[PDB]
Scaffold this motif. Structure first.
Motif, PDB file in Angstrom:
ATOM      1  N   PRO D 140       0.806  -1.232   0.000  1.00  0.00           N
ATOM      2  CA  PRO D 140       0.000   0.000   0.000  1.00  0.00           C
ATOM      3  C   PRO D 140       0.831   1.270   0.000  1.00  0.00           C
ATOM      4  O   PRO D 140       0.305   2.332  -0.356  1.00  0.00           O
ATOM      5  N   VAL D 141       2.107   1.199   0.388  1.00  0.00           N
ATOM      6  CA  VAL D 141       2.947   2.394   0.400  1.00  0.00           C
ATOM      7  C   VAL D 141       3.037   2.992  -0.997  1.00  0.00           C
ATOM      8  O   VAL D 141       3.023   4.217  -1.167  1.00  0.00           O
ATOM      9  N   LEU D 142       3.134   2.138  -2.019  1.00  0.00           N
ATOM     10  CA  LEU D 142       3.198   2.633  -3.389  1.00  0.00           C
ATOM     11  C   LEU D 142       1.966   3.454  -3.744  1.00  0.00           C
ATOM     12  O   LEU D 142       2.062   4.414  -4.517  1.00  0.00           O
ATOM     13  N   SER D 143       0.802   3.096  -3.194  1.00  0.00           N
ATOM     14  CA  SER D 143      -0.404   3.872  -3.457  1.00  0.00           C
ATOM     15  C   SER D 143      -0.251   5.304  -2.961  1.00  0.00           C
ATOM     16  O   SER D 143      -0.694   6.250  -3.624  1.00  0.00           O
ATOM     17  N   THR D 144       0.372   5.483  -1.799  1.00  0.00           N
ATOM     18  CA  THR D 144       0.636   6.808  -1.256  1.00  0.00           C
ATOM     19  C   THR D 144       1.937   7.410  -1.771  1.00  0.00           C
ATOM     20  O   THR D 144       2.212   8.582  -1.490  1.00  0.00           O
ATOM     21  N   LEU D 194      13.624   5.657   3.560  1.00  0.00           N
ATOM     22  CA  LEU D 194      13.823   4.243   3.299  1.00  0.00           C
ATOM     23  C   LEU D 194      14.650   3.607   4.413  1.00  0.00           C
ATOM     24  O   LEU D 194      15.345   4.302   5.159  1.00  0.00           O
ATOM     25  N   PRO D 195      14.594   2.281   4.548  1.00  0.00           N
ATOM     26  CA  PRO D 195      15.450   1.611   5.535  1.00  0.00           C
ATOM     27  C   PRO D 195      16.916   1.764   5.162  1.00  0.00           C
ATOM     28  O   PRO D 195      17.303   1.558   4.008  1.00  0.00           O
ATOM     29  N   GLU D 196      17.731   2.127   6.146  1.00  0.00           N
ATOM     30  CA  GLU D 196      19.136   2.406   5.886  1.00  0.00           C
ATOM     31  C   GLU D 196      19.869   1.130   5.485  1.00  0.00           C
ATOM     32  O   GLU D 196      19.638   0.057   6.051  1.00  0.00           O
ATOM     33  N   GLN D 367      15.222  -7.922  -9.198  1.00  0.00           N
ATOM     34  CA  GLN D 367      15.712  -6.732  -8.510  1.00  0.00           C
ATOM     35  C   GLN D 367      14.665  -5.626  -8.522  1.00  0.00           C
ATOM     36  O   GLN D 367      14.468  -4.936  -7.515  1.00  0.00           O
ATOM     37  N   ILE D 368      13.983  -5.441  -9.654  1.00  0.00           N
ATOM     38  CA  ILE D 368      12.897  -4.467  -9.713  1.00  0.00           C
ATOM     39  C   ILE D 368      11.783  -4.865  -8.755  1.00  0.00           C
ATOM     40  O   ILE D 368      11.223  -4.022  -8.043  1.00  0.00           O
ATOM     41  N   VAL D 369      11.441  -6.154  -8.722  1.00  0.00           N
ATOM     42  CA  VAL D 369      10.416  -6.627  -7.797  1.00  0.00           C
ATOM     43  C   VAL D 369      10.852  -6.386  -6.359  1.00  0.00           C
ATOM     44  O   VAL D 369      10.061  -5.933  -5.522  1.00  0.00           O
ATOM     45  N   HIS D 370      12.114  -6.686  -6.047  1.00  0.00           N
ATOM     46  CA  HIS D 370      12.618  -6.438  -4.701  1.00  0.00           C
ATOM     47  C   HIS D 370      12.554  -4.955  -4.360  1.00  0.00           C
ATOM     48  O   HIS D 370      12.155  -4.580  -3.252  1.00  0.00           O
ATOM     49  N   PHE D 371      12.946  -4.096  -5.303  1.00  0.00           N
ATOM     50  CA  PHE D 371      12.911  -2.660  -5.054  1.00  0.00           C
ATOM     51  C   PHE D 371      11.483  -2.170  -4.850  1.00  0.00           C
ATOM     52  O   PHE D 371      11.209  -1.401  -3.923  1.00  0.00           O
ATOM     53  N   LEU D 372      10.556  -2.613  -5.702  1.00  0.00           N
ATOM     54  CA  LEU D 372       9.178  -2.146  -5.596  1.00  0.00           C
ATOM     55  C   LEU D 372       8.542  -2.598  -4.287  1.00  0.00           C
ATOM     56  O   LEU D 372       7.784  -1.844  -3.664  1.00  0.00           O
ATOM     57  N   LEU D 373       8.836  -3.825  -3.854  1.00  0.00           N
ATOM     58  CA  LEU D 373       8.219  -4.355  -2.644  1.00  0.00           C
ATOM     59  C   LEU D 373       8.808  -3.746  -1.378  1.00  0.00           C
ATOM     60  O   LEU D 373       8.110  -3.655  -0.361  1.00  0.00           O
ATOM     61  N   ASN D 374      10.071  -3.328  -1.411  1.00  0.00           N
ATOM     62  CA  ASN D 374      10.698  -2.772  -0.220  1.00  0.00           C
ATOM     63  C   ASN D 374       9.953  -1.523   0.236  1.00  0.00           C
ATOM     64  O   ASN D 374       9.540  -0.691  -0.576  1.00  0.00           O
ATOM     65  N   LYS D 375       9.783  -1.398   1.546  1.00  0.00           N
ATOM     66  CA  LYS D 375       9.031  -0.316   2.158  1.00  0.00           C
ATOM     67  C   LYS D 375       9.715   0.073   3.459  1.00  0.00           C
ATOM     68  O   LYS D 375      10.472  -0.720   4.027  1.00  0.00           O
ATOM     69  N   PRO D 376       9.469   1.286   3.957  1.00  0.00           N
ATOM     70  CA  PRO D 376      10.113   1.698   5.209  1.00  0.00           C
ATOM     71  C   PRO D 376       9.678   0.833   6.381  1.00  0.00           C
ATOM     72  O   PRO D 376       8.533   0.383   6.463  1.00  0.00           O
ATOM     73  N   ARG D 377      10.615   0.604   7.296  1.00  0.00           N
ATOM     74  CA  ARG D 377      10.367  -0.224   8.470  1.00  0.00           C
ATOM     75  C   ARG D 377       9.999   0.637   9.673  1.00  0.00           C
ATOM     76  O   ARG D 377       9.022   0.365  10.369  1.00  0.00           O
TER      77      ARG D 377
END
Lengths: 144, 28, 60, 377
Positions: D140-144, D194-196, D367-377
């Motif tokens: 949902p982060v991508l939505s915002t 983003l997560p450091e 890698q694109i999938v990993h980047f898109l799915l990554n979200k702040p912790r």
RNA sequence: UCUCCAGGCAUACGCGUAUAACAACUCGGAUAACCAUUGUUAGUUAAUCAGAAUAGGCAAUAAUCACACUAUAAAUCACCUAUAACUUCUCUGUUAACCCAACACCGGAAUGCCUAAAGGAAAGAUCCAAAAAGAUAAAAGGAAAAGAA
RNA sequence: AACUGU
């Protein structure tokens, strides 16, 4: 009782302030004879302010204004003032130096603080008593 | 230069004093 | 007098290097020492300037 | 009665120490700029002749040159560290590539040279558009999040110094002024950091480059114009952070031409230079948007990702901003260094035959999938 | 390092090596120092900064944050239809304290930014003449404040 | 008219 120096009365004191600051830092300065004579009185009176005491609040205001570089302020109260405690005056020695060969032929003098660590200046020496005239005067003194 | 080559300019062009006024020739 | 000034410049140069910074005027007395002369107890509590030259004959 | 005045240089004197106090006064004023806008205004209100830096350049060791000015260390490889039917993305991406190349009908470009470049942009945009939608249910982060299309990143900083050798100002010391303006193909901006990728103050043996010659000696020209530091959107925009940056290299810098030019080794350098320039310039702006500047260096590292593609190959880059202090005064006391992690460019697919694309490489897609799915912790 | 001064930086135009280093101390600077002079050698680095296909068809409505709102002073190639061509980064400008005023002129000189972080020194020396010029101050008075005719 | 070393 004052030489007409500077573009204004402030300039003379500021110029004197610049001259005074340099002399304290180095303890021996070469400048035009007229300037050296004019600033000699200020230097002697400044030493009296140092003798007055470090705790003297008025001395700090005089020292702070006259000495642009503040590292000299401890020096005046802890170097110059202790040095001249025995002396009652004549802290500054001013001597005439040959005029500058800079096409303006200004009268030059060197002003230094006595008791300094610098090499002694080549001061003039009076004639020795061993001279024939002095020996003759010595005989007259002995008879009297 | 390419291919990682490097260039450095080569170092091109790496009488007697006691008797003066009398020539030493004179023996007289 | 030229000798005195030249020696003064050399002495001043040594002081400047020793201080190592502007506005570092000591609050203690200063003394100059030449080669062959070593700091003494009387020289304690005074800035000491060391000169590679030997004590000049005129300077005492 | 200890009232001794401080042992300091007079402000009014015409000396280096006196000027330094005057210089310090201005530096003190920048410390006292409370608001972000006031900090930016003071730094950029005067225009001065400054180097114009191109994020994408053909210079030899261009990545090294940029790192020296930025104090960025580039470690080879990726930084130390919801299923979505990864096969489904390939089929969807396969359709997208076939959609623009073989199905969409559009007026042919007149130039006949932009055709190849135009096609690469269309396929990249479509894949990104579909990827955002497909990844939206999982994250949902991508939505915002805010996705920026070809909007510009600006940054202005001083590194190095020089003495004027001639002219009315002969002998005066002048700092080397630089500017990077970059327009990434796409970039994702989020409102949360983003997560450091590594703790702040991290130190590694790899050392920042140092440049033998002046920036002028290499083609780089100083011009007087507005100083700008920009995150891709105004400070008003809520998304003051971002996830990933997308870059498309022009044909002149593409692998084929570079190999012909014999600068095959610099193909990665072109990849590295663009990534380091964009991410540092973009990341630094956010910290400025947070009130951090050279003397108020970031308390938390600024981290993000970037991907650079030559149309066929795809490279992934990760940047962490640890130091905002590159001025001599602010950099006088700083053990931190900026750290960049980049991966080599890799092909995303092999060829387009008929209505079926062949040889699609999921590894780059992962890698694109990993980047898109990554979200702040 | 100190005292003091407060329009600075880019481009345009013009100039054309006046640029910089070294070496000279005669000439040139409307006197020297020092060089702007003299001699020698160097310099200004660009795919990004700057300079250097065709034939037809067919277009009513200003701007002013353009919306409302009115107005008068009246203010907006494209795109279609065909024809033709079919893979490119060279050349040139880039220095300077510079130009037009016979001058290192006092003024003339387009534009953008900004007002000190940038840029600067009124003191050739001595004397403290008179007179003269400018500025400041006035005991008591107030034409021998700015209001009226 | 006042004002001020006019």
């Amino acid at each position: 009782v004052y030489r007409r120096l500077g573009l204004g009365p402030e300039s003379r004191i500021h110029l004197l302030r610049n001259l005074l600051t340099g002399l304290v830092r180095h303890e021996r300065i070469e400048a035009t004879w007229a300037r050296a004579d004019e600033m000699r009185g200020y230097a002697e009176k400044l030493i009296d302010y140092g003798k007055l005491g470090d705790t003297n609040e008025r001395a700090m205001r005089m020292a702070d204004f006259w000495l642009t570089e503040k590292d000299l302020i401890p020096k005046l109260f802890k170097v110059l003032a202790p040095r001249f405690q025995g002396q009652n005056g004549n802290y500054t020695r001013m001597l005439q130096i040959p005029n500058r060969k800079e096409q303006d032929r200004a009268k030059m003098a060197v002003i230094e603080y006595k008791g300094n660590y610098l090499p002694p200046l080549p001061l003039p020496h009076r004639d020795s008593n061993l001279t024939l005239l002095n020996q003759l005067l010595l005989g007259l003194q002995q008879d009297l | 230069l390419a291919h990682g080559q490097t260039f450095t300019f080569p170092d091109l062009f790496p009488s007697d004093l006691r008797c003066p006024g009398i020539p030493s020739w004179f023996g007289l | 007098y030229e000798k005195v000034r030249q020696e003064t410049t050399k002495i001043r140069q040594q002081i400047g290097a020793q201080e190592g910074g502007p506005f570092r005027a000591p609050s203690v007395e200063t003394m100059v020492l030449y080669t062959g002369e070593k700091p003494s107890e009387k020289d304690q509590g005074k800035r000491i300037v060391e000169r590679n030259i030997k004590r000049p004959s005129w300077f005492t | 009665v200890a009232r001794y005045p401080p042992i300091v240089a007079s402000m009014t004197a015409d000396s280096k120490a006196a000027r330094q106090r005057r210089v310090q006064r201005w530096q003190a004023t920048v410390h006292a700029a409370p608001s972000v806008d006031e900090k930016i205004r003071i730094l950029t209100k005067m225009q001065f002749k400054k180097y114009v830096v191109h994020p994408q350049i053909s210079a030899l060791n261009a990545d090294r040159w940029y790192q020296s000015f930025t104090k960025t260390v580039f470690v080879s490889g990726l930084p130390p560290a919801p299923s979505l039917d990864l096969a489904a993305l390939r089929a969807a991406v396969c359709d997208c590539i076939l959609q623009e190349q073989v199905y969409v009908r559009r007026r042919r470009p007149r130039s006949l040279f932009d055709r190849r470049q135009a096609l690469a942009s269309s396929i990249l945009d479509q894949v990104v558009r579909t990827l955002v939608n497909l990844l939206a249910p999982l994250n949902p982060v991508l939505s915002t999040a805010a996705l920026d299309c070809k909007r510009s990143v600006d940054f202005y900083w001083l590194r190095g110094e020089e003495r004027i050798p001639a002219g009315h100002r002969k002998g005066h010391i002048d700092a080397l002024r630089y500017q990077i303006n970059d327009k990434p193909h796409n970039q994702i901006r989020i409102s949360k950091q983003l997560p450091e990728f590594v703790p702040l103050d991290y130190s590694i043996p790899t050392e920042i480059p140092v440049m033998k010659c002046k920036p002028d000696k290499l083609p780089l020209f100083r011009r007087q114009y507005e100083n700008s530091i920009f995150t891709g959107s105004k400070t008003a925009d809520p998304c003051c952070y971002g996830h990933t940056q997308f870059h498309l290299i022009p044909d002149r810098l593409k692998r084929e031409r570079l190999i012909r030019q014999n600068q095959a080794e610099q193909v990665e350098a072109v990849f590295r230079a663009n990534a380091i320039a964009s991410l540092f310039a973009w990341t630094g702006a956010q910290a400025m948007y947070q009130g951090f500047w050279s003397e108020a260096d970031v308390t938390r590292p600024f981290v993000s990702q970037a991907v650079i593609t030559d149309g066929k190959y795809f490279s992934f880059f990760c940047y962490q901003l640890n130091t905002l202090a590159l001025t001599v005064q602010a950099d006088q006391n700083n053990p931190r260094k900026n750290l960049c992690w980049g991966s080599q460019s890799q092909p995303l697919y092999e060829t387009v035959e008929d209505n079926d694309v062949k040889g699609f490489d999921d590894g780059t897609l992962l890698q694109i999938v990993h980047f898109l799915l990554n979200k702040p912790r």
